[PDB]
Structure formats: structure tokens, C-alpha cells
């Protein structure tokens, strides 16, 4: 298995002389993974109250996507991290951070570490969760900051709040910045994790009575809190000068609300402005925002992507050659026909494109392609090719990951 | 390979082989009322001499009742309560079970009663599309459900007809079954005390002190008082008609709604401390539970703990119905003394409540904490470990069992 072979199997055409290559050469990298944020519940107003004003404001000054998809399996948050760090698929069976925490895993932090970046990840819960204390070394992060680093002050749910996350991380980044140390920081938010129970004094949305004592109402309070704290973190990055010297990426780890299951009177709260009339496609959309210094071309990215695509997309902006490193993702700024294979909650060979989703049943022929306007799509040759490629890619990714060398 | 015996062995609660009260209510009707957002630490409260729940307080002298009965809910609280009660299986840590498994043939209390000559119905004044009830109720084998279409749009409180309309329109249906010798199980789901607790001004009967007036807790007290009043009127009709003397009647709160430790300091004096558990969330997770059956000679406080999953096995014993090979994760609370209640979703998996302490894990079992209900720490002994392991295994088995249920089509 080689990098070329994998790319040929996927069959997505990527520019040989890529645009934006090294547009952010030598810049820092800050990535924030936002817990349980989904695109169809962002940019929503409840009686004039914006739920995600921070994300809404970023649309004018970033490249962002309305068709960016989660690529997760059994352990959703950890599968998101797996996808992003490794550009390999999460398992259909295992939790990869558990099963492969004993391997030497090629990765984004490892590659950046070979290009003079110090690398760290930040999360306020204990790193024993999902085997993170083994996984983070396995992917070659120089450091991870876990509950031991963050206090037990201002707990929301089961660990310190996003406010504590950003306030304790920022000074570390500021000191690296002042000392001319190129850095990659990954922050994993948590305050908007289910059950979305936010202290009363931190709830800022006055909910209408059809949202009171509902999962969706609680979700909106938690997302609003998380978005607020993100905005305060961004303002500190701007004031400090870090923003103008860094690539910054924000994405939701995965969806949490099944919007077609909502009570009928709550459905009016779902954002329909970029709705896909196919499930689970619509819900599987996660917000995605990308900033880099001196960007001249902000706006909507048309090519679809998933979490596995973040690494190749970012490495291109940072001007880093990936060489022989196997990546199952694609640089989304240098392709136009990308697609995203899915598994676990969907059968193997399921995938999303920029215009339709395919899902098999007992066989390819008994499956269904559904256009994003809701109409059926005939199972043509191209639909078949992506199904076959998707299944082969998953096989290769599973085999590749399973054959990684042991750390000991 | 999951059997009823295996599940019971995993839980490890000792249940009398020759049970007491078996068939004490053989052949009687069953009426169960699920009271929206009632919690035990906000019942039997007086505000300046005014009783908030005088109906429930009065029942204490003539029922078996519990001061340590717990909610067992997850993502969709009201529906998870119904799930727990009808199925005696745990709500999911991930799904809303009434949504995800509404396409299954689900073994249940109404299904089992239907095989013992009961006609079964559930009543709720909102639209049955909510939480997939219009599929869930058939899935568990209710003969009928009566929803908003049946109740009309008179006397709306909040978003649907009042508890008064619920009881007034249900009663004549029960009365006709009674007169025609049709044994029945009726499940009524109240709604007037749902948040935001908006009760019409002419229906507010508590004169609130200024530290409660126009506050969430104040509105909560008016709504609970209204709901308790209407429950009392329903009971009086059951008594007058003769149905009361021919029926097992169970009342329970679906789940708590007020986080009492988050109240303003001056409102905390309103919380009932008389049977306080000095552990959270144990204290708030207590829901009222009252059981009546005709010719009961032994009214008073049930010492053994229970949760919503325990209602089915407890009731089937009273009705003299053998459950056979039907898998139940709950326990007959009148024939055990060491029952415990696993919790999830708002607590980590392996958390549980006993009659004397709560356990909650952290990163591992060993880094968790057992807290006695007097507030003191409890050392993590072998028995504490066994219940943690059993709790986690029970949740796994329940999730697997429910996921493997056959499709209705
Ligand atoms: Cl008790
Ligand atoms: Cl559930
Ligand atoms: Cl139990
Ligand atoms: Mg997550
Ligand atoms: Mg409820």
C-alpha cells in the first residue's frame, strides 16, 4: 500500500500544481474541535437571539463549508480526532484510539514536528478517556494538556468549562508566539457535550415555551455558551497578534440532534437555508471554518469534505510536502469532485458527494442514491464506481492501520 | 442467549421465591397516573400553611408509598419514563428508545396484561406524534391510545388540554368498561405541570410569598398544586363510582425538574428535608410513588428502593400474573430488600442508588465515590464494586436485548 495507490483508488482529481500552496508557510496552526455542533443548528435565531453569533460572524472573513461531513463510528469524539490527526478512517468495529494506541502512527502532529512545529493538544477531561494518554503519544503530539493541567474550577458537565479551556490554553500559545516557536495547538471543547446541562447563571437564551425542558432547548443553551467562549478566545488571538500569524480551523466533531425526529413544532428551529433533503446527510453536516493570514478569497467552499480531509487541506496551506505519507483524505481546496465514505451507522460503501448520497442495502443494486433535492438518482456507472472505491478505501485504510509498527 | 434468569442473576437482587402479596389484587383493574415533573423533595411542602400536594399527603395513610423511589430516564425524559415503566428495560444512553424502537414488537406490561383479559389504553392530551408515541404505543401492544384528537381544545393549559380535561374525558371510558365487566389497564400521562408551569390566573390557588412570586419555583408550586388538585378530583370519582375499590392504582412522578442545589439561597428553605438524601443528584432524582390496592392491610412506607423500571414486576405480582420467560430488568420491590437502581446519561455508566448510598465512577471504579445518604463517605468495598460491575453489565444487556427485538413488519 502506497500513497499513490490510495489516491488512485479514491479517484478524486487533485491539481498537480496546487493553489494556495504555502499561502501560510511558516505560520502557526490552531484547530478547535467543537463538541456536538452541527451545521443545520448553527446560524439560527431564537426570537431574535443568535445561537452561534461567533460562527455567523466568521462567514465574512473565512473559507467555510455548508457541505462538510463528520467521518466517525462507534466512539464519535475520539473517531473525529482519529480522522483529523491520521487522515485514515475510523474502524467499523474498534475504537481506533484504544486498539491502536500502541502503534507509531503517521499523522499531522508528527509531520508538523518534522517541520519545526511544537505540537500540543488540550482537553479538560482526564486523558485516560478513550485511551488518549496512549493515543496522543502514538500520533506524536509533543504534549497533551488534560484535567491535571486544568483545575476543577468552573466545572460544566463532568469537567472544566470551555472558558477554562481557552483561558488556560491561551497563555501557553502566547508564550510560544513571543518566543518565536512555531506551534500547532489542537483544542477539544466539551461544554456542549450531552446532556447539555449548563449552570443556570450561564444560560443566556430566553427560550420559548416549546423549547423549555426539551433536549433541543438545552442543546441550544449549551451551543450558545460554547460559541460565546469561542468568540472570547478568538478576540484574544486577534489582540495578541496570533490570529494574523496563524492558520485557524474550526469544525464540529459530529452531530447530536436527529432533526427529523424532533417534535413537529420544534422543526421550525432547524436551519433550512442549505438543507440536504436526504438523511442522514443533512444531520451529518458539521460546521467548518478556515482562516489564514492574507486570505483574499473568503466565502463558501463548493467542494465537499469530511474530517479525514482536514490534514491534506492544511498541509497544503502550510507549504508542507507529505511525500510518501498515506492519506485517505483529499486537499479540498484543490479538487472539485471529492466524496466522503461513511460507515458504522451506514453500511460499507455508503458515501456523500456534492449533489447526492448513496447507501447500499443487501447489495449495490438494492441500494438507493438520493439527490440533495430529495429525488431519487438512478444507480449509474459513476454511482457504482464510487461505491466500489469507497469499500476498497475502507479495506485499505483498515489494513494499513492494522499493519502499523508497534511503539515497543 | 439472553434469558430472564440470566438477567436476574446479573442484577443479583434477592427476590422471594414464594412472593408475598401474589395475586392480592388478582382480577382487579389497573390505573397508573404518571405525574409530570413531580419530585419527592418538593412534595408534602407547606407555603405559609398552604399544602402544595394535599392529595398525595392524604394518600400516605392509605397506600404503600416510597420516599426513595427514583427516576430512570435519559435523553427524552417523559418518554424515557414511559419506556421504563412499560418495558422494564433501561432507556438508552444514546437513542430515544420510543423513536428508535417504535418499529419493534416489544414485550411489555400492556402486552402481557392483554394476554390476561385486560383491555389496555393510554391517555395524554397532546398530539401522539410527540416522541413517536403513535408508533411506540402499538409497539408495546396498547390496544388504544387517546391523544389530542380525542380531548378537543377546551381548557388548554400550556400547549394542550388541562389535567382536568384529561381526567374528565378518561373517566367515562373507564366507567363503561367497569360496568361491562371488562378488566382494564389505563395509563394516564399528566401535562399541566410541565415547564414553564404556566397556570391560568383563576386556577392559581397558592398565595405566594415575595421570594417565590413570579419565579420558576413559584410557578412550579402553583402548577404542581393544580395538578395535585385535579388528581384528587379524579380519585374522588374513582371512589364514588366503585372503580377505586376494584383497582390497583399507582401514581408516580416522571422525573425531577428543579435542581434544588441551584435554587436561590432564600428559596432553599422550601425544599422538603424530612427524607433528604445528602448526596446529589440522588436527592433530586427521587420521584413520588404511591400504590393502592383493594383490601390492603399494610399501608405505609416501602423501605426497599425502586425505580421506574421496577413498576412492571411489582404490579404483575400484585395482579397474580406470572411473567414466565419475559425478560425484566426491574425487580418486584415488595419482595426484595436489597434492590438498587442503575443510572445513566446524566451520570456515568455504573452509577447507582441503593437504600443507603449512591455510587458514581470517575475515570475508573477506584477513582469514583460512594456517598452515604447521611452525607458521609463510604469506602469502596467489594459489594460496592459488585453493584458497579452489575450495573454496567445490566445496561449492556438491556441495550443488546432491546436492539435485537423483532421487527413489526
Ligand atoms: Cl421510602
Ligand atoms: Cl431512550
Ligand atoms: Cl432497579
Ligand atoms: Mg463529541
Ligand atoms: Mg416529563
Author numbering:
A (entry chain A): 203 to 610
B (entry chain B): 202 to 610
Question: What did the paper state?
Answer:
The lipoteichoic acid primase LtaPLm transfers the initial GroP subunits to the glycolipid anchor but is unable to extend the chain further. To identify differences between LTA synthase and primase enzymes, the soluble extracellular enzymatic domains eLtaPLm and eLtaSLm were overexpressed and purified from E. coli and their crystal structures were determined at 1.75- and 3.0-Å resolution, respectively. Although both enzymes were monomers in solution, as assessed by size exclusion chromatography, eLtaPLm crystallized with two molecules in the asymmetric unit and eLtaSLm with five molecules in the asymmetric unit. A structure/sequence comparison of the two enzymes highlighted two sequence insertions in LtaP that form two extended loops (residues 544–552, loop 1; residues 561–570, loop 2), which interact with the long helix α18. The insertion loop 2 in eLtaPLm forms a negatively charged protrusion, which is repositioned through Phe-566 on α18 by ∼2 Å compared with eLtaSLm. This also leads to the formation of a surface groove, which extends to the catalytic site. The specific loop 1 and loop 2 sequence insertions are conserved within primase homologues suggesting that the resulting surface features are specific for the function of primase enzymes. In this study, we found that Thr-307 in eLtaSLm is phosphorylated, whereas the corresponding residue Thr-279 in eLtaPLm is unmodified. Specifically, our work revealed that LtaPLm has a smaller active site cavity, lacks a second GroP binding site, and that two conserved loop insertions results in subtle alterations to surface cavities. Based on our functional data, which showed that residues Ser-486 and His-488 are required for LTA production, we suggest that the absence of these residues is an important factor contributing to the inability of the LtaP enzyme to produce a PGP polymer.
